[PDB]
UniProtKB/Swiss-Prot annotation, chain B:
Assembles, to form an icosahedral capsid with a T=9 symmetry, about 60 nm in diameter, and consisting of 535 capsid proteins. The lineage of its organism: Viruses, Duplodnaviria, Heunggongvirae, Uroviricota, Caudoviricetes. It comes from the Viruses. This is Major capsid protein. It is found in: Virion.
Length: 278, 51, 50, 100
């Protein structure tokens, strides 16, 4: 969020308020800055944003701009008074990857403080299937998915995928930590289907002729061995060209109109619909 | 047979499990490639008067 | 205050306020197995943090 | 049924494999400071005030490191057991017929 800064010259107090916030005590606007920092987010803090604005203002009149050595530059005499919405602080982030074998109980543990209480927790899970999205873990079935400590009893190969805690404060401020669960399947289930994402594939002759676009393949169930992929049926050469490397199909447009690519692992097939525009 | 396979191409080595990978997949040549200073043609032509 | 909400039926277990609401405190009982972890320091002597 | 029995002719029998796991951790930055004037040192009664303050600073740093280590160890516990009938943190209660 953008945080405004105001400076009282007589008391030497620099108040940090929200972008919409306001103060009526003699404090003059000295500029604004983004507090979670767009580039270099964990590299700087409010002190650095308040010091870079005050450097651009006159010590004799803080409403006017000045240059060194007639600017505000001794921060030892300046006191920052924070009155902006407080940020949530991850005290303990989630492990980047947890690993287990089928049948064991997994347990995630996030520490989160700061903001305004009460703090609420909502766990979510994204499957490893290509093109999947995160989705709330039912907290009626799993009472722990509404707390800071999640527990997944007796993992399966389907438990594998990204997990994510989203903590919200009473002001609506939010923080999130994520963790990939890897599950060791002793006897991997044999492929039932191949999934293509994106499918359909939308191409533009104007935009995509040089580099094309890519389609990724995944196996169902998750953790099955997809095997070696090959193109069984090429697209119409008057509409598109296609090449496959590993689990990635690259498709390049030739002219407007619809075509299809059939990809196989020798036992299963998937059709990618390709829509080419001008 | 334990194979090295191609870790950088998505094929892990046999020794590496589902939650493991090669620590060193390349060698870093620490002698860098640098460009030389540009040539100056007009600075040599200048005679200097002391100030 | 990480436990369940506490009411006047509290037999005498510890609680704390969470934004004007009383919740039971949660206390740990930790077992640290042998060789289960190590600490990391930057340019240390191997015995303690720098 | 799975013992690696061997006959006198040998052969390509009882082949096995091995696996490997990787684990990682990161470091974080900490620090605090205090300020003083020359008069608060020279005119102060205790000629050893700076030694006192430095010792307290070191003690605070060590205590903070110990607390952070304990917090990390608690967060990293592989198994969590809930006393009583509790199933989650929000359910841990000291009242009712089955307190935690």
């Amino acid at each position: 969020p953008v945080l405004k800064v105001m400076f009282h010259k007589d008391t030497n107090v620099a108040t940090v308020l929200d972008a919409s916030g306001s103060l009526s005590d003699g404090s003059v606007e000295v500029g604004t800055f983004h507090h979670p920092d767009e580039t270099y987010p964990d590299s700087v803090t409010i002190y650095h944003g308040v010091r870079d604005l005050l450097y651009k203002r006159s010590a004799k009149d803080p409403s006017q701009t000045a240059s060194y050595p007639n600017n505000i530059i001794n921060m030892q005499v300046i006191s920052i008074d924070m009155k902006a919405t407080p940020r949530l602080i991850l005290g303990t982030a989630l492990p980047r990857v947890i690993s287990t074998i089928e049948g064991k109980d997994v347990t995630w543990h996030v520490d989160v403080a700061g903001g305004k209480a009460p703090l609420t927790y909502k766990w979510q899970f994204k499957a490893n299937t290509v093109g999947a999205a995160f989705a709330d873990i039912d907290s009626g079935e799993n009472p722990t998915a509404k707390t800071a400590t999640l527990i997944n009893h007796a993992v399966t190969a389907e438990s594998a995928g990204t997990y994510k805690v989203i903590v919200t404060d009473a002001n609506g401020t939010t923080i999130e930590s994520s963790s990939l669960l890897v599950v060791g399947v002793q006897e991997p289930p044999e492929v039932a289907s191949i999934v293509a994402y994106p499918s359909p594939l939308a191409l533009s002759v104007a935009d995509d002729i040089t580099d094309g676009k890519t389609v990724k393949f995944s196996s169902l169930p998750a953790g099955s061995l997809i095997g070696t992929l090959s193109i069984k049926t090429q697209p119409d050469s008057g509409k598109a060209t296609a090449e496959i490397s590993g689990n990635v199909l690259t498709v390049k447009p030739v002219a407007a109109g619809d075509t299809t690519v059939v990809v196989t692992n020798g036992t299963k097939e998937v059709t990618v619909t390709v829509n080419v525009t001008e | 047979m334990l194979n090295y396979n191609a870790p950088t191409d998505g094929q892990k080595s046999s020794i590496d499990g589902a939650n493991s990978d090669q620590m060193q997949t390349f060698f870093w040549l620490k002698k860098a490639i640098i460009t030389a200073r540009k040539e100056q043609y007009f600075m040599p032509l200048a005679s200097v008067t002391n100030m | 205050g990480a436990g369940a909400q506490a009411t006047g039926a509290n037999p005498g277990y510890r609680t704390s306020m969470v934004s004007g609401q009383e919740h039971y405190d949660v206390y740990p009982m930790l077992v640290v197995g042998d060789d289960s972890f190590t600490s990391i320091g930057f340019q240390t002597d191997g015995k303690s943090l720098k | 049924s799975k013992l690696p029995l061997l006959t006198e002719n040998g052969g390509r029998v009882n082949r096995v494999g091995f696996t490997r796991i990787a684990r990682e951790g990161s470091i974080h930055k900490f620090g605090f400071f205090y300020e003083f004037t020359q008069e608060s040192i020279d005119f102060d009664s205790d000629d050893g005030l700076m030694e006192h303050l430095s010792r307290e600073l070191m003690n605070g740093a060590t205590q903070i490191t110990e607390a952070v280590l304990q917090k990390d160890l608690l967060a990293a516990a592989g198994t969590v057991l809930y006393a009583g009938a509790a199933t989650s943190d929000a359910t841990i209660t000291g009242e009712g017929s089955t307190p935690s």
